[PDB]
Scaffold this active site. Structure first.
Site, short mmCIF file in Angstrom:
data_model
loop_
_atom_site.label_atom_id
_atom_site.label_comp_id
_atom_site.label_asym_id
_atom_site.label_seq_id
_atom_site.Cartn_x
_atom_site.Cartn_y
_atom_site.Cartn_z
N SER A 1 -2.14 -0.03 -11.62
CA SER A 1 -3.05 -1.02 -10.78
C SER A 1 -3.35 -2.10 -11.91
CB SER A 1 -4.08 -0.32 -10.45
OG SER A 1 -4.52 -0.93 -9.21
N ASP B 1 0.78 0.99 0.00
CA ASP B 1 -0.34 1.19 -0.96
C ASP B 1 -1.56 0.78 -0.12
OD1 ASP B 1 -2.21 0.38 -2.82
OD2 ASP B 1 -0.39 0.07 -4.38
N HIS C 1 -1.38 4.45 -3.32
CA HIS C 1 -1.76 3.86 -4.54
C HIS C 1 -1.56 4.92 -5.80
CE1 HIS C 1 -3.08 0.67 -6.98
NE2 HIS C 1 -3.87 1.39 -7.50
P1 LIG Z 1 -6.35 -0.78 -9.10
O1 LIG Z 1 -6.87 -1.34 -10.37
C1 LIG Z 1 -6.68 -2.32 -8.01
C2 LIG Z 1 -8.04 -2.65 -7.80
C3 LIG Z 1 -8.61 -3.55 -6.86
C4 LIG Z 1 -9.98 -3.54 -6.38
C5 LIG Z 1 -10.29 -3.91 -5.15
C6 LIG Z 1 -10.53 -2.86 -4.04
O2 LIG Z 1 -6.97 0.78 -8.74
C7 LIG Z 1 -7.19 1.82 -9.22
#
Ligand SMILES: *[PH](O)(CCCCCC)OC
Ligand SMILES: CC(=O)N[C@@H]1[C@@H](O)[C@H](O)[C@@H](CO)O[C@@H]1O
Ligand SMILES: CC(=O)N[C@@H]1[C@@H](O)[C@H](O)[C@@H](CO)O[C@@H]1O
Ligand SMILES: CC(=O)N[C@@H]1[C@@H](O)[C@H](O)[C@@H](CO)O[C@H]1O
Ligand SMILES: CC(=O)N[C@@H]1[C@@H](O)[C@H](O)[C@@H](CO)O[C@H]1O
Ligand SMILES: *[PH](O)(CCCCCC)OC
Lengths: 291, 291
Positions: free
Chosen positions: A139, A213, A250
């Site tokens: 992420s 995702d 995700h």
């Molecule tokens: P990732 O780091 C993407 C997070 C985006 C934050 C907005 C919901 O996830 C663990």
């Protein structure tokens, strides 16, 4: 004051120094415009503070064998993101797992989180005998890796490859903490990364992601429109290989058996990118790899 | 190492100095990121060479009353572009027509063509008693105007408004001479303008264009996708006002009666942009204005 249709070239004129930084990746008469290569921007955090965020399993970052740097996702520490997966999986592959845990849980300024990674790469490169090392992310970790590679020239030759799981280079439309604002599609940060040429790979990169995702979107086109896509990178959308019934979310993008096969391929590839010949329909397993 | 969802702000963190130039127009905690404002890039051409390309009708650029700077299209000189239209039309409106004719016929490096405009603005500003002046352009002339405003900070406060007819800020897909390569959609030059924040107006700007332009495309959406569109600008696609049967081509975009009414509105507007209240269906005349 007469005929002039003459001026005819076979290439676009080179951009002047003042505009060159804004056309990275484009080709002009002298060739492909590369990223600026001046000195590294200064850190806003003391080096001792950045060092406190770096840890390796069973070794010191200053003297480590075959390290792999793991960069966590938003709202987590290195252990929370990788304890159940890539820490033990990479150790099994012969690496010494190392990770950064930028406080507080990657919720702060992504630009600061990147300082932890840049410092970590500098440290591990030297710590492993001045040898390039792979970086594996999840992420925001991928966004951090690319931000670092784009704005800190010194680490470009210290990272041998990047294996990013569900990276949000374009942020997400499904989006508060500082880094959450920055990862919202249309943010100043994601705009800056794109405008500086960061959506084209800098080191051999593999991006593994899923159309299903639930945190990062859009990811459904299997094309440059996807948030995890990098030009010239090995972009692997799970469903393009496994079909529309293959569902991994995700976190599954990081921990599934499919993800492990692709990640393993990327880590051992002599090209620095995962190879299609190393995975197929039989690897389309949504179950946890470390299981 | 405990609870941290805490970090909560009401704005996106400010970008660090090294990334700020890549997010012009975006809003962070400190406000809207503005264009860099350092010193002007150096000219590649001697000033005497740039001066040779500037001319005013019935006066010297160094001592002129109410000047208007006209910037020509690709493959033409100032007189070829405006003799039949804006030179006499602007004189009738009370201005002293001035223009640049970058050699050879605007076919050379657009970055060099811009030097002629920057030098001209510097000259006419002082020449008119240190008073701002309007800039009126056709085709590449608009791209040159915006390139100048984006990369040469000194002229931003010397240009009172921009009236651009059929400007190709995104270049054209219907596209060799140096400037032709640069105006081809996807070129390094158009990429640089966009990445530096040049697709958002810098001074009060009015863009008049046509969906039936046979040289510059795409122009059919009446939206940000059009090549002549600038964020915050007064974007006037002829057909949005006049309907699909109103046909004016690339040159007609500059010389039609409709174009004159819109241009006149922009030149006299206290906002610096054409006003919808100044034109309507009755002005939807494709015939030449100077006729
Ligand atoms: P990732 O780091 C993407 C997070 C985006 C934050 C907005 C919901 O996830 C663990
Ligand atoms: C390192 C950490 O977790 N704390 C910082 C805090 O010191 C800082 O004031 C704030 C805004 O910059 O961002 C975090 O909360
Ligand atoms: C000013 C002019 O019309 N001539 C120039 C020429 O001197 C130059 O060598 C060439 C490529 O830079 O571009 C134009 O042809
Ligand atoms: C914005 C856009 O055009 N992207 C579409 C996406 O919406 C669609 O879900 C996908 C189907 O796989 O195809 C892409 O081309
Ligand atoms: C690329 C795109 O989606 N732009 C379309 C354009 O192709 C179409 O001609 C126009 C109709 O006026 O509508 C726009 O939205
Ligand atoms: P304009 O300057 C736009 C020209 C683009 C060149 C490619 C055909 O026209 C007078």
């Amino acid at each position: 004051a007469a005929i002039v249709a003459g001026p005819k070239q076979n290439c676009e004129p080179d951009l002047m120094p003042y505009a060159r930084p804004f056309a990275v990746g484009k080709r002009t008469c002298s060739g492909i415009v590369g990223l600026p290569s001046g000195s590294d921007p200064a850190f806003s955090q003391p080096k001792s503070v950045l060092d406190a965020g770096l840890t390796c399993q069973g070794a010191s970052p200053s003297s480590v064998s075959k390290p792999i740097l793991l960069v966590p996702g938003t709202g987590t520490t290195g252990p929370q993101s990788f304890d159940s997966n890539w820490i033990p999986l990479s150790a099994q592959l012969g690496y010494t797992p190392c990770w950064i845990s930028p406080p507080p849980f990657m919720l702060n300024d992504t630009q600061v989180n990147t300082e932890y990674m840049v410092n970590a790469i500098t440290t591990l490169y030297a710590g492993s005998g001045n040898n390039k090392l792979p970086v594996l992310t999840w992420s925001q970790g991928g966004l951090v890796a690319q931000w670092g590679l784009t704005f800190f020239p010194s680490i470009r030759s210290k990272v041998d490859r990047l294996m990013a799981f569900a990276p949000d280079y374009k942020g997400t439309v499904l989006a508060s903490a500082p880094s959450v604002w920055q990862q919202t599609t249309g943010s100043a940060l994601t705009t800056a990364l794109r405008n500086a040429g960061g959506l084209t790979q800098i080191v051999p990169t593999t991006n593994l992601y899923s159309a299903t995702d639930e945190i990062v979107q859009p990811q459904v086109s299997n094309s440059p429109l996807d948030s995890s896509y990098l030009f010239n990178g090995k972009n692997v959308q799970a469903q393009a290989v496994c079909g529309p019934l293959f569902v991994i979310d995700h976190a599954g993008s990081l921990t599934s058996q499919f993800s492990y096969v692709v990640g393993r391929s990327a880590l051992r590839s002599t090209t620095g990118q995962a190879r299609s010949a190393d995975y197929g329909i039989t690897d389309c397993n949504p179950l946890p790899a470390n299981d």
